[PDB]
Amino acid sequence: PSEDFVVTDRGGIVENSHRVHAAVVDAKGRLLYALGNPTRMTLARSAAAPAQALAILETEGVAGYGFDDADIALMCASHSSEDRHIARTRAMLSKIKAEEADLRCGGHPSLSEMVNRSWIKQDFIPTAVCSNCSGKHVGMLAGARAIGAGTDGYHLPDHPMQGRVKRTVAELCDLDAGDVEWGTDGCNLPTPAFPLDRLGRIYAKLASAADGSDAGEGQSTRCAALAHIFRAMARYPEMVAGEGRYCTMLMRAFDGALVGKLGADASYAIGVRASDATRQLGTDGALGISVKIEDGNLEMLYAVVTELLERLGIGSPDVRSQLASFHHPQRVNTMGVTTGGVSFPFKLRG
Amino acid sequence: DPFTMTPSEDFVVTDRGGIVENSHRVHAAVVDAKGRLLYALGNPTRMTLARSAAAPAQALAILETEGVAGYGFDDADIALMCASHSSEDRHIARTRAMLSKIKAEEADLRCGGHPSLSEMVNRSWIKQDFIPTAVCSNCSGKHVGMLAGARAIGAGTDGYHLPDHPMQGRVKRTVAELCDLDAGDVEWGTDGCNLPTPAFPLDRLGRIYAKLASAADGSDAGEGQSTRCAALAHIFRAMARYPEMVAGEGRYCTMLMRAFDGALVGKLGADASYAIGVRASDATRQLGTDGALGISVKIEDGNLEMLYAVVTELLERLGIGSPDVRSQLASFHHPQRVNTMGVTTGGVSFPFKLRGDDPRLAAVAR
Ligand SMILES: [Zn+2]
Ligand SMILES: [Zn+2]
């Protein structure tokens, strides 16, 4: 495994360096390109949300609630707690006849500094309905209600809804139950850990299912649900994160060519639909990308993800230039002087 | 394998339920009053931007500027020269009092405003829609001292912050001399407050602080000192007596220095460097030196929360502190990992190994 770093400098002098791991996999999960240790055991955190959305959508009876594509995107989200995410959360609660008091997630400072500053000015204390995970929680309420399971402990590991989540994660990873480890996330759900390349496998299967759907293929019910999830994220990326957020600007820039998702502590995953770019990389199908910054730095994650799309030729220069402020973050001091930059001395191995 | 551990494996690590979340490479040097390396983590000579952990050397360059003594700066003013302060009202007030002492105005500052280094101060700013200005800079005390030096020598206050200005020529020389380095062995960038900022091997940052602490020792014992040594001792005394000017309420540097009640001074450098100067004590003697001691730390990826955890762990391993004094730092030592429903999800640990084994075990500094 290579010593792959992203490095920041001040006047050419090394400031910080961050170890990068990355996996690029085809639709079956075969490893195509790598940085660092592409199989590093990694907490997927909220980059697992589409698999959790799959578990929700595959639960008997959930279809009768009439969740729409923006609802599903919110199930996939780490949203910024904008008023529009709160509103959709309440509208999802109304659809399943539940109440904010039924949520088992808690409030937290918004993932958007601008939202949080507006909260601070107004003395606003976030509650359960503000959780960046509030959409997947409503979905898990919905699933528990759907099969009659009882709603108080829908978040606990021994509840049938978390059993479905756990089975669904392992099946998407093509792992045995024993090879996925579990802790607890900030929103109080079980959260999985598995080799980094398998996170890319999940998103390659999202993008693969989307390709099979627009191609009129016989699809399994699971493939069709994955296709729907892809479609929902790509259509409502503002629900997946929010205004000014990397995930939203990425997906907006690519206009349905890919879906992408943040994991807390600096994981990222992308599913890329089949394209001239994927074919040039040497695969006849969809593509998956997963990334982990070893030390957890988000600013460096987004810089590295954007540099990696460039290395991979994914997008056009014009399309990627929408992400320019993430690719080379601003390094400007309190008097407007540029003090340094970011570098990418890493080499993608194939 | 505990019998093949290497500096490349010196890490501080967070976990979720025992599953590794993040890991951060640790570099540290522990040196005696002459800079002799006593203990190390990672690469103790890593070329490193000291950032505002260099501030006591800039304060020294200010105080050794002929004619500055006539302004009547007091020990709290000097502590503020050594500061990365929280932009509390008292820090802003002292900045304006220092401007008045040298007959200058806020428009003479060449630093700019920025969100407070204190979350609580920043919250009050956000409520009031307050836009911070030059006089709010965490470096304002330093900048005023540089204005004072430029005035005292007749240099001209426009440009005091630029490398070619004699005040910055004084800084650059003073820094190299404290590190015992030739000029070509210190590199220079520009910091957030718009001053030249130095980079030199990590151990030399410990060297500067060992020299602060040593000078304090000599002054307190009544030894005849050079003008420089007496000035170092004054800087030490100022930081240790007014630690709230060096940082602010709730800040690590202030809580560290209050807890130790004069036994040491310590200072943050941005992007996760730390420096501590320790007066001679039973603890330093058990560590095997007959004088003062300096410590310098760098988290490679720049994480501050991990910095404070690591510095506190390292003080415990060095036997510096009592569990009682060091217990005021307990929230820094083991950062809370509690989710939005009050459940603890994980923790920090310190898989690093202080060195200073089989002779065939190479200690390749990395
Ligand atoms: Zn969550
Ligand atoms: Zn400064």
Residue numbers in the entry:
A (entry chain A): 3 to 352
B (entry chain B): -3 to 352, 358 to 367
How is this structure described in the published paper?
The ReAV enzyme from Rhizobium etli, a representative of Class 3 L-asparaginases, is sequentially and structurally different from other known L-asparaginases. Asparaginases (EC 3.5.1.1) catalyze the hydrolysis of L-asparagine, generating L-aspartate and ammonia. ReAV is a homodimeric protein, with each subunit containing a highly specific zinc-binding site created by two cysteines, a lysine, and a water molecule. Two Ser-Lys tandems (Ser48-Lys51, Ser80-Lys263) are located in the close proximity of the metal binding site, with Ser48 hypothesized to be the catalytic nucleophile.
Substitution of Lys51 with alanine induced notable structural rearrangements within the active site region, and these changes are not strictly equivalent in the two protein chains. In chain A, the absence of Lys51 affects the position and conformational state of Lys138 in the metal coordination sphere. The side chain of Lys138 adopts two alternative conformations: one rotamer moves away from the metal cation and forms H-bonds with the Oε atom of Gln54 and the Oγ atom of Ser48, while the other rotamer maintains its typical conformation, pointing toward the Zn2+ cation. Furthermore, both the zinc cation and the coordinated water molecule are only partially present in the mutant crystal structure, with a refined occupancy of 0.5. The Ser48 side chain has a slightly different position depending on the protein chain, without the characteristic pattern of three closely spaced water molecules. In protein chain B, Ser48 retains its typical conformation, pointing toward the water molecule in the metal coordination sphere; however, the interaction with the Oγ atom of Ser80 is no longer possible. As observed in the previously described S48A mutant structure, a sulfate ion (at 0.5 occupancy) from the crystallization solution appears in the active site area, forming H-bonds with the Nη atom of Arg47, the main-chain N atoms of Gly188 and Cys189, and one or more water molecules, depending on the protein chain. Structural analysis and careful inspection of the electron density maps revealed the presence of an unintended, second mutation at position 238, where His was expected. Thus, the crystal structure of the K51A mutant discussed in this work actually corresponds to the double K51A/H238Y mutant. The Lys51 residue from the Ser48-Lys51 tandem, with its side chain unprotonated at the high pH (9.0) of the catalytic reaction, acts as a base for proton abstraction from Ser48 and participates in the proton shuttling network during the catalytic process. The K51A mutein is incapable of L-asparagine hydrolysis because the Lys51 side chain can no longer play the role of the nucleophilic activator.
